Please model this.
Amino acid sequence: EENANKIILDEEKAVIQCNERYKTENDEKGDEETVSWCRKAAKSGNAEAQYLFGMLVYDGRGVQQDNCVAMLWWMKAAEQNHAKALVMLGNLHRKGQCIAENYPKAIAYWKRAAVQNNVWAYHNLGTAYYDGIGVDKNPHEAVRWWKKAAELGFPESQNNLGALYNDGNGVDRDYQEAVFWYRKSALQGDELGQYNLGVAYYYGRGIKKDFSEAVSWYKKSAEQDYAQAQHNLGVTYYEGEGIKKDYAKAVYWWKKAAEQGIPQSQYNLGIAYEEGWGAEKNPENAVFWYRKAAEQGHADAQNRLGIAYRYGTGVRKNPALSVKWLEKAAKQGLARAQFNLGKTFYIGAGINKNTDKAVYWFIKAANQGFTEAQAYIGMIYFKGKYVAKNEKKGFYWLKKAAEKDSAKAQAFLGALYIAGNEVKPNIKEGVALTKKAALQGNYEAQTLLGFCYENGLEVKKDLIAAYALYLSASPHFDFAEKARLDLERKLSEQEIAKAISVNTAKLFE
Amino acid sequence: ENANKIILDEEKAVIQCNERYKTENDEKGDEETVSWCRKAAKSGNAEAQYLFGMLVYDGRGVQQDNCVAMLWWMKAAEQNHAKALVMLGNLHRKGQCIAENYPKAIAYWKRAAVQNNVWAYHNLGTAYYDGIGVDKNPHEAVRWWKKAAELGFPESQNNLGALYNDGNGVDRDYQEAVFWYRKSALQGDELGQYNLGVAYYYGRGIKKDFSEAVSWYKKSAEQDYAQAQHNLGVTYYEGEGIKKDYAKAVYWWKKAAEQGIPQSQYNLGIAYEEGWGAEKNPENAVFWYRKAAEQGHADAQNRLGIAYRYGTGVRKNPALSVKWLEKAAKQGLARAQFNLGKTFYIGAGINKNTDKAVYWFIKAANQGFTEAQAYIGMIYFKGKYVAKNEKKGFYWLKKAAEKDSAKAQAFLGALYIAGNEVKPNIKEGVALTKKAALQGNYEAQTLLGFCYENGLEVKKDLIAAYALYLSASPHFDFAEKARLDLERKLSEQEIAKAISVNTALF
Model:
């Protein structure tokens, strides 16, 4: 109190203690002593200790949290031109803490710290000019400030420059400039810089495409628990891009990415369960992750969830919920959901049949090139029952679907060519289309091919081959069963014995 | 064999073909007209060869065939039949029977033009205006179209009228347009009757006269011309040249909307929403709004955007609201630029975007939209989302108040009364506070009540403080707490006296 050297020793001691105890990963008991020493050192006038003691009070570390007490000591340090304290005052005005919200004063504090070459001041001013925070938005001015912090190595400013030159939202897109700053961020261990550098290698933006290098940076970022890097690393394993294909490592990383809420990771993880790719087959686990992604707007997940309600796989069968999820994806423009919703209305299973909505959605999906939608809309146009009859449009869509090996379109085009009734006879191409559809398991085509062998249509008449084909399709097509019983009346026991034992493989060649 | 029988058979066939061609018969008399015209065409009659060729071309009483028609038009053309030459030119122009051949088409029309045929004149005019077989030349098109117009051809009179009305290829001359359009309108042509009414409605090339405009609009609309149906509806809607009749306006706008006139569809939608000329129907208004919006109508796009914001006539959807408001803001509609700016500024349903909000406010304010001038003035003054500029902020805040904006007057008066962020000017501030309080602004009525409760500038009338806070209590939370606080210190006599005083305290 009165001894001058005692005063010198006490304050110099409190400053040494505050700086040393602040750096320690301390417990709740050691944090109270840290506050005790920094209080004495802040009271003595040491600017750095006033900044540290204000930080403790702001974070509630070892002392009751108080935004206004923190501002008091940051003000005393700022009065000594403490650069970090000045940044902290700007944040309080920017966030409206203790004092009222005041963006112009936040900018003024940050600019005062920028005179001292503080990288937080540089960064926050770059953010302010990019988002229009108390200043007119000027992305080029944002780059000026962000470059100042980036050249001093601040990774957050480097990632902002990398993203800006990557999107082109404010300045011209420059992939190579983006790679420059993203690499500098990655070389310092920043997960967001490492992820974006891997994206650069993966797509070849600003650098030569290299999957092996993308895996290298994806993995360093994924091991820091960055969700989007865990997803892309899972994709490189699934596709075998830059690394050996490993469905288990894909599911390993998709699980961590799905847990953090990445919708594509959840959808991919659901496929892994439904199919058994990299995980044990499980319908409930698949629907669990499909729902997680469908609730975020993932169209493919909404469609898979809508199908799971249609047949009750992994969940209770619910035609009402199936239409709700199929429609959300169909309205998003997913062609395969537009077809499934159209087929649901066209068949009328679990809900009322509605051919107007069926034709409406079949046309939407056919126009996007969905093969099975083109087969349905081709026969609707050709029949002309629920729509005006149009043979040109019918054959247009039927041939387009048959071009992509549509088993349904092939079987019907073959039936038309073989009958030669509603169209000109084209038996040779008709039997060929019939054989192609029969190989894909279509038993209507098998019955039609058996009809050709029974009556010598293009093929040489062979009742043995006809019975064998009718027998194969008998459990699935009612005409095949009736045609098999009729042939059984006309064939001898020896012929029945050969026909039953016939391998029908040669009949489809 | 018999010479007198041959002459009498030819003359009877010629007479029959001419008389049976004028008559509009059915399938019974049609297949009998071709029999008499074939007999007269086989005899060598040039006119009957042309008529029989037309019968085969149209397929009236015989099988339709382009080549058989050309056949008899050639026999007629060898006799220099005018119309038959025009028909031979059209076949080569269109590529019927023979291959497409623009030069031969021009050559046939020019041969028919030598004999002063209006169709040859008109088609040669169209040929020079479209560049069909000849180099494009509007002046040469006017030459041919005039020759057919001097002979009374309506379609040539309309083309000249439209050219001189639009100044496309010649100097725009509204008088010259009216000159040709009148010749067309007097013959009963629906297009000439419409444009003559347009001239009377706007005073272009003729003295403005709404009663004549209605007269010609009605004659063109009765022939189902869609654009005349719209303008005739406007005259009924505005009472210009005829007694105002909203129901008669909606009547013609329905016919014009079904034909696809965007403005008719828009006006019809307003009728269904507001109830002028029809019973109110919210869903039917949105139907016609969308119909006009799809065709690029700016006001319809803005109307459909507002309807999508508040769900008025359709399911509420902020995403689609931003789409339709944006398409109208792109077209420079100042009202939609403000609505899109306010949508981005509030962030209700979509993401708040102050950058786009400021961008559209500046754009709408430069067109004189006072509401946008008020929003941008408070933005340049607050200095939160832009750099603070009080000089620019007061420039827009005054213009809004100088044109009676309740938004600006309530805030600009709040600054003058407080005297905190600006020098105290409370005398003029109370005057601005009264004006905005007149127009339902519960905020200005609240700040004016603040001057009465605390005795700020105005004579301290605490009873009037309850009367001003009363109207705003169920609407503004502060005025509700301001009317609740004054209620704790007022007696029942002063409560009953305050809830009845005429606030128009202004």
Notes: Chain B has one domain: 1-506. Residues 102 and 132 of chain B are 7 Å apart (CA to CA). DSSP finds 28 helices and no strands in chain B. Residues 3-22 of chain B form the longest helix (20 residues).
